[PDB]
């Protein structure tokens, strides 16, 4: 009843042991002038707490003589026949098997340095990801802007053709090539200027794909760091929990960690 595997005997650190366990995983807890014990069960991925002359129970069907009595019965069976909306029943509670205590504690530092080195790599890349998302979108807007600029110039190389070829045929002899050269010059500037702008826009779009390429490669490697970070952290949490069963040593821990 002290040991009881699942039996620990507060709210917060329960939820840390219930974080990322699947549908059906459970444990029991201990104000006493409130109720005695508390079955904290994670049905469907959400904390579902259940309150507990001799007989331990949930409300009226009290004939179970112990805390261990009531939980063996409902490891076999669901909680539906007690309370309507409850159709779920994992009593969850390696480490190289090490009885070393000290050398288990060195590994905790080692895994934690591995983990904390690993979190920074994940943290780095999350900045890269979002900066890249920004840099990209700024490039996209810039492309809309270039494209827009270009319209105004394409429209301007057109805009002049209407007025300029009205001012060639009207007159013609008056300032023959003295006029029409210096209208051809201005226009020959105008189109090569367009020519430069388009090439400036292209050169952004090639950089866009190289950026968007790298953007994939960040996420790609984020998603291969992620699953490792979960296990690396989870192994650290079992190494740290395995220690904090035998010797209390809450304060000794912090040098390794």
């Amino acid at each position: 009843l002290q040991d009881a595997e699942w039996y620990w005997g507060s709210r917060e650190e329960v939820n840390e042991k219930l974080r990322d366990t699947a549908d059906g995983t459970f444990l029991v807890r201990d104000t006493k002038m409130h109720g005695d014990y508390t079955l904290t069960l994670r049905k469907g991925g959400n904390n579902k707490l259940i309150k507990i002359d001799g007989k331990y129970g949930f409300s009226d069907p009290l004939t179970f003589s112990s805390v261990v009595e009531l939980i063996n019965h409902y490891r076999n069976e669901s909680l539906a026949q007690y309370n309507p909306k409850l159709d779920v029943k994992y009593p969850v509670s390696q480490v190289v098997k090490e009885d070393n205590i000290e050398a288990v504690g060195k590994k905790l530092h080692e895994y934690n340095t591995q983990f904390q080195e690993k979190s920074r790599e994940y943290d780095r890349l999350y900045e890269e990801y979002t900066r890249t998302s920004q840099e990209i979108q700024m490039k996209r807007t810039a492309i809309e802007a270039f494209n827009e600029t270009i319209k105004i110039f394409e429209e301007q190389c057109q805009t002049q053709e209407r007025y300029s070829k009205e001012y060639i045929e009207k007159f013609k002899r008056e300032g023959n090539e003295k006029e029409i050269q210096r209208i051809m010059h201005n226009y020959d500037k105008l189109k090569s200027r367009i020519s430069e702008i388009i090439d400036s826009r292209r050169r952004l779009e090639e950089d866009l794909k190289k950026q968007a390429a790298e953007y994939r490669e960040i996420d790609k490697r984020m998603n291969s760091i992620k699953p490792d970070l979960i296990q690396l952290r989870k192994t650290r949490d079992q190494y740290l929990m395995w220690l904090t069963q035998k010797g209390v040593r809450q304060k000794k821990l912090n040098e390794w960690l």
Partner: protein
């Protein structure tokens, strides 16, 4: 020998990281032209003329469009086709901006650099769209920082439906403004800055000899120059009008005037004047105890004599222009088929995710997890099979959720996520509202782009996350299909839900005999029950309720109406997946007794998404929440908008109206919205709201637009200092800074405007000799300005505030807010600890403003200054000795009282909030002896995400230094009465916060919205439970607090 000769082969130091010179993270934003920060001082600009000619002027960076136009048409004469141009006056400039929109440049005073031009060119045109007036939307869009057109071409009906309907609220507020104008207009602009209570705490009351204050009314007569004191001694609880009279009495008593002749000269004169605060645009515009105005109450506390000014109402109503509000340019299926008709389970067809970036080496197989939610979930969570894993992943499955379509609640939302495989690990996520804003159940095909899993989330699905598709295109796009029922299904009317609820009750009244699992169902209740209910009511939000307690609550819901405050708990005890239940709850909440705002605010967090509930919650605010207390909690109310399902909602209509009713709220409401605009989770939502505000706010837009323009100048300026003027001497940088600031574009832009930190303060001229870049690597700017008040002298001649590009202010913003609140709790509950919650304001992505506190120093400076020449050790006493050096005489004794009263409160706030470890370089002491912490780092113990685990840290650990000073220089200070009293403050402080713990949970719960890594989910906030010890009795808490306090101190502490 050191390393076992083990070579690290990968490591390189030819530049290998931003650990080396480790500061200044956030980027980027190009400034004055595309791809460059600060445009060249002389620059070539292509002018595109209406005759099709490209004449290129060399212009100065700094030059006005007037100057450019005027030169362009002088220089277009030298190019051909001059007879085809009109007189320059028939033209306006245009170009493509960096936002990517062809902006017409109407305000021709603007300078070439200030245009935000992308490419440096200008097209000439005669002004299309003859309403010049109306295309000062560009004003709005400047203030918002995204052009107003960008909405106008949004497809989505909701968005347009928001834009058009929200003007209801805007026009209603403008009505209230010009109601008793010009008084009410001044009432909008310059609301009375006033504490919530008129009642005075007992430690203020004792500073005034049975409620009397020596005031100083000032006046001006001719020409302006000379002013005259009029040093009244009026009552604390006397109103501005009485204070205005006595001033005019004493002004105009005379030897050529009988008393009867004075009384008449009082009356005429009296109400032609109103009271200003000397030195800032604050005023005393309504019947309020003088003490109730914040300026007075601070003058009491600080041992100061209020300097007010008598101001003529007409010289005031001179300075208010007209609001000039205008309605903008922009002005189901035959009774459908009620969701309750629909006879089927929920099923949602998953189809194909397209853009999923995963190593086929690393990850085996990948699947879509799904689930339905309400904050928590109304059925067993389900997935789909592990099919087509990684390479082009596709499942054409109907997922089957065990809930009947009618038992969907209004606020139901699907939450999904692509995952990796117990190698379980989310790749993306996205959530969708199962109904739309028109109440319509979601049918057919939907295409959802997903969000990347953030830092703190390990969990698979993430329903607190924002509802809707990512706008970012190039991300995982998981499209899917919902069931179609030959008819648009709408959510039931309330009239109909009222009937089903009335039926559900009458039905229960004949359910008979034993109903074991009494659980969800006696008229006369037991006394032990009625005590187990109020006992539940008192519990904080994070004390999670059991199934027993829920069922117990849900049954006695009709008694729960006697104890309104239970409502949060009750609502979380409803089976949201039983419309029978939900409907009955909708009839309680209808006429549930309104509750206190501090309690009603919980009901707008993520755990209460139902619209009816949130209505009740806004209904509470509408009643109790004063413009004071709204302003106090405005950050938590802006943040809580994210959790609303739809754009258009009662909470937005509330806050928007309040913003337009009162300009001090308005101000911060703009800036907090504007602060977040870079975050694409809310860009749309907040943009739309900010448009509405900006459109209806009256002249303030133009004031905002200068504040905004100043902030952009500084953002650019620093951005440049931080890149390319890095690896440069301060000497070289400071030269560059001053050089820049002297250019006239900077001079215009950074001078005549209002403090975003506090728009009451004006900001005048730049004294550039007192402007400088601090030593920090983030290259913050220490900026200084002349206070252009008439009475600068009487308040502060120099206003100086710190601009810091590079650092996420919002953690600080919230901790400082929380501090401010603990102070108000403490003080207003008669106990005087003096926290200095200095001003802080994030105006953007890691960009903000921090209030300077003149004459304060880091303990380090104190000790550097007090350190002996031969570099040996710094003396614990030097603090004490440096403090004495300032405070000498009866002063000394009082300055230790301050240091003790501050140091105590800061100990208890620090401990409870668990903020970053305190040490000599982040603790500050003022000349007058007040202590206050700066640079808080991570609040709720966010370096416990590495190891952590029941660490319940003490961050302010009072070294000798502090103890000496508390104990007036004795040795073995830990044993004096000086110290006993100190501890008794610390205990009394700790309990006060422990009785308001609900609020601080809820404030932190409201803040989960913002994307702060310190606030990822409720367990983050749970630290504040341990540290307040809310699972325990208060007596254990006291003992816990001591225990905790003792062990870190090696001290006495019993």
């Amino acid at each position: 020998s050191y390393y076992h000769h083990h070579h690290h082969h990968d490591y390189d130091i030819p530049t290998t990281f931003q650990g080396a010179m480790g500061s200044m993270p956030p980027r980027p934003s190009s400034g004055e032209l595309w791809g460059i920060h600060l445009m060249p001082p002389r620059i070539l600009v292509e002018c595109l003329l209406p005759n099709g000619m490209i004449v290129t002027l060399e212009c100065l960076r700094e030059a006005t469009l007037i100057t450019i136009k005027h030169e362009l048409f002088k220089e277009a004469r030298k190019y051909p086709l001059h007879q085809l141009l009109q007189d320059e006056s028939s033209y306006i400039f245009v170009s493509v901006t960096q936002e990517a929109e062809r902006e017409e440049f109407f305000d021709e005073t603007r300078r070439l650099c200030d245009l935000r031009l992308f490419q440096p060119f200008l097209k000439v045109i005669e002004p299309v769209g003859n309403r010049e007036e109306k295309i000062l939307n560009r004003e709005i869009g400047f203030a918002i920082g995204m052009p107003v057109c960008e909405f106008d071409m949004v497809k989505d009906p909701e968005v347009q439906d928001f834009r058009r309907n929200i003007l209801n609220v805007c026009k209603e507020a403008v009505d209230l403004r010009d109601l008793n104008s010009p008084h009410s207009r001044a009432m909008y602009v310059y609301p009375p800055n006033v504490e919530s209570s008129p009642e005075l705490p007992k430690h203020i009351y004792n500073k005034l000899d049975k409620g009397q204050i020596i005031v100083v009314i000032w006046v001006i007569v001719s020409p302006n120059n000379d002013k005259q004191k009029y040093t009244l001694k009026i009552n604390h609880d006397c109103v501005p009008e009485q204070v205005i009279a006595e001033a005019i009495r004493k002004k105009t008593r005379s030897m050529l005037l009988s008393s009867e002749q004075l009384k008449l000269c009082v009356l005429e004169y009296q109400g032609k004047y109103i009271l200003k605060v000397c030195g800032c645009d604050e005023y005393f515009l309504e019947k309020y105890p003088l003490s109730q105005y914040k300026y007075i109450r601070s003058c009491i506390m600080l041992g100061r004599m209020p300097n007010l000014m008598l101001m003529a109402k007409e010289s005031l109503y001179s300075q208010l222009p007209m609001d000039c509000f205008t309605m903008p340019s922009y002005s189901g299926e035959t009774s459908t088929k009620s969701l309750w008709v629909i006879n089927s389970a929920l099923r949602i067809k998953i189809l194909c995710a397209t853009y999923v970036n995963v190593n086929i080496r690393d990850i085996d197989k990948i699947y879509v997890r799904t689930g339905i939610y309400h904050g928590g979930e109304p059925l067993c969570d389900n997935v789909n099979t592990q099919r087509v894993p990684c390479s082009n992943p596709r499942w054409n499955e109907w997922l089957n959720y065990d809930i009947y379509i009618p038992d969907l609640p209004r606020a139901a939302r699907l939450c999904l996520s692509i995952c990796s495989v117990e190698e379980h690990c989310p790749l993306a996520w996205g959530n969708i509202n199962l109904f739309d804003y028109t109440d319509t159940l979601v049918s057919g095909k939907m295409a959802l782009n997903l969000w990347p899993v953030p830092h703190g989330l390990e969990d698979l699905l993430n329903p607190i996350g924002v509802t809707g598709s990512n706008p970012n295109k190039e991300t995982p796009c998981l499209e899917l299909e919902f069931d179609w029922f030959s008819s648009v299904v709408k959510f039931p009317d309330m009239s109909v839900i009222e009937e089903h609820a009335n039926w559900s009750v009458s039905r229960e009244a004949g359910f008979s005999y034993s109903h074991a699992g009494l659980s969800n169902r006696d008229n006369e209740l037991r006394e032990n029950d009625k005590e187990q209910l109020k006992a539940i009511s008192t519990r904080d939000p994070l004390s999670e309720i059991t199934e027993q307690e829920k069922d117990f609550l849900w049954s006695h819901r009709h008694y729960c109406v006697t104890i309104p405050e239970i409502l949060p708990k009750l609502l979380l005890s409803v089976k949201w997946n039983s419309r029978d239940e939900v409907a009955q709850m909708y009839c309680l909440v209808k006429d549930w007794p309104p509750i206190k705002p501090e309690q009603a605010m919980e009901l707008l967090d993520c755990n209460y998404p139902d619209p009816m509930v949130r209505g009740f919650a806004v209904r509470c605010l509408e009643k109790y929440l004063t413009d004071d207390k709204l302003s106090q909690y405005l950050i938590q109310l802006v943040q809580v908008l994210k959790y609303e399902q739809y754009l258009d909602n009662l909470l937005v209509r509330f806050l928007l109206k309040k913003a337009l009713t009162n300009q001090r709220i308005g101000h911060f409401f703009f800036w907090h919205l504007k602060s977040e605009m870079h975050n694409k989770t809310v860009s749309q939502r907040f943009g739309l709201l900010l448009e509405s505000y900006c459109r209806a706010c009256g002249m303030y837009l133009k004031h905002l637009n200068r504040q905004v323009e100043a902030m952009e100048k500084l953002i650019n300026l620093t951005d440049i200092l931080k890149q390319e003027k890095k690896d440069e001497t301060q000497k070289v940088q400071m030269k560059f800074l001053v050089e820049q600031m002297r250019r006239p574009d900077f001079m215009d832009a950074l001078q005549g405007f209002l403090s975003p930190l506090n728009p009451a303060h004006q900001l005048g001229n730049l004294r550039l000799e007192e402007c400088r870049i601090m030593s920090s690597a983030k290259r913050p700017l220490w900026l200084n300005w002349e206070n252009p008040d008439i009475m600068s002298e009487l308040l502060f001649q120099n206003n100086e505030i710190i601009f810091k590009n590079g650092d996420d202010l919002r953690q600080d913003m919230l901790t400082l807010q929380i501090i401010r609140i603990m102070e108000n709790i403490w003080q207003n509950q008669g106990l005087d600890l003096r926290m200095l919650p200095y001003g802080c304001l994030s105006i953007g992505d890691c960009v903000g403003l921090i209030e300077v506190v003149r004459n304060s120093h880091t303990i380090m400076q104190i000790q550097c200054k007090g350190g002996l020449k031969g570099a040996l050790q710094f003396n614990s006493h030097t603090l004490h000795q440096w403090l004495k050096d300032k405070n000498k005489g009866e002063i000394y004794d009082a300055a230790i009282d301050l240091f003790t009263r501050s140091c105590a409160g800061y100990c208890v706030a620090t401990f409870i909030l668990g903020i970053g470890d305190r040490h000599n370089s982040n603790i500050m002491v003022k000349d007058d002896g007040q202590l206050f912490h700066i640079d808080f780092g991570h609040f709720l113990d966010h370096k416990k995400k590495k190891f952590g685990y029941k660490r319940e840290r003490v961050p302010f650990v009072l070294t000798q230094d502090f103890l000496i000073v508390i104990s007036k220089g004795a040795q073995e200070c830990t044993k004096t009465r000086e110290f006993e009293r100190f501890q008794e403050m610390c205990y009394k402080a700790y309990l006060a916060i422990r009785q308001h713990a609900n609020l601080f949970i809820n404030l932190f719960s409201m803040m989960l919205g913002s994307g702060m890594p310190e606030l990822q989910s409720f367990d983050d906030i749970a630290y504040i439970r341990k540290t307040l010890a809310l699972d325990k009795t208060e007596q254990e808490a006291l003992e816990y607090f001591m225990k905790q306090m003792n062990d870190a101190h090696h001290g006495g502490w019993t």
